[PDB]
């Protein structure tokens, strides 16, 4: 203990050993003057020697699972309602249009929305996924920085629908969220983003 070889997870375990012992046990251990240390350090005394799967939270009525996705901090926010289209002719649609029209029939973007289905080995012909533009609404979503926000929004959606699909997704990062943020406005920089003004020496 003095040599400090434990981590933060152990302190929680030592601590819950202390709360859990009754004051009667203290006076029952303060006799030895060593025994209560064995308990307050129970797990750590032995540790010197030696992917989450949540419950699926679907709507039992409509069979709809909801997930959320965010990229560029907040400038893009989409949520992906997903249900099982039993007739195998399901579709992915976005903002009242098939994924083609919103993404302007671009491959490198419409393919990103596809990964969460294939990554989990599932077939999207069964699944009916609509995406809702919660963030700052823009005319055309034809940029990957928005696609990933959708690629994540669909990823989180499948997990809520299907519990053990979180394993192949999390190992491939589609669930994990970027913390990248485009620099907010600032007057000092001439363009306002990252390029300062000019200064000439005399």
């Amino acid at each position: 203990f003095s040599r400090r070889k434990f981590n933060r997870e152990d302190v929680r375990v030592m601590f819950e050993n202390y709360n859990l012992m009754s004051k009667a046990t203290l006076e029952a251990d303060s006799t030895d003057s060593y025994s209560h240390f064995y308990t307050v350090l129970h797990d750590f005394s032995r540790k010197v020697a030696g992917v989450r799967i949540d419950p699926a939270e679907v709507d039992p009525e409509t069979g709809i699972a909801v997930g959320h996705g965010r990229a560029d901090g907040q400038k893009y926010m989409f949520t992906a309602l997903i249900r099982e289209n039993r007739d195998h002719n399901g579709s992915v649609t976005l903002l009242g249009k098939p994924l083609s029209v919103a993404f302007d029939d671009k491959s490198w973007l419409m393919e990103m929305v596809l990964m969460p289905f294939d990554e989990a080995k599932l077939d999207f012909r069964d699944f009916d996924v609509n995406l809702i533009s919660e963030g700052k609404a823009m005319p055309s979503f034809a940029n990957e920085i928005a696609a990933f926000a959708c690629r994540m929004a669909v990823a989180n959606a499948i997990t809520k629908l299907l519990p053990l699909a979180r394993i192949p997704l999390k190992k491939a990062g589609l669930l994990s969220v970027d913390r990248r943020r485009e620099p907010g406005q600032f007057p000092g920089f001439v363009d306002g983003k990252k390029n300062k003004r000019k200064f000439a020496k005399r």
Binding site: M115, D118, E119, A120, K121, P168, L169, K170, K171, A172, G173, S176, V177, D178, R179, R180, R181, K196, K198, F199, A200, K201
Partner: protein, 44 residues
């Protein structure tokens, strides 16, 4: 302005220090591992 030279790359912080460690590199195609372990178990 700087008026001093440009610093090196290493002294600058990591260029993508925000993207999660899971994404660099993206371990894509986890679907196939179950297909490949089978055919490999087939030949073996």
């Amino acid at each position: 302005r700087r008026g001093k030279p440009r610093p090196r790359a290493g002294m600058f912080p990591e260029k993508y220090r925000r993207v999660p460690t899971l994404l660099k590199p993206q371990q894509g195609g986890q679907q196939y591992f179950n297909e490949f372990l089978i055919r490999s178990a087939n030949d073996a």
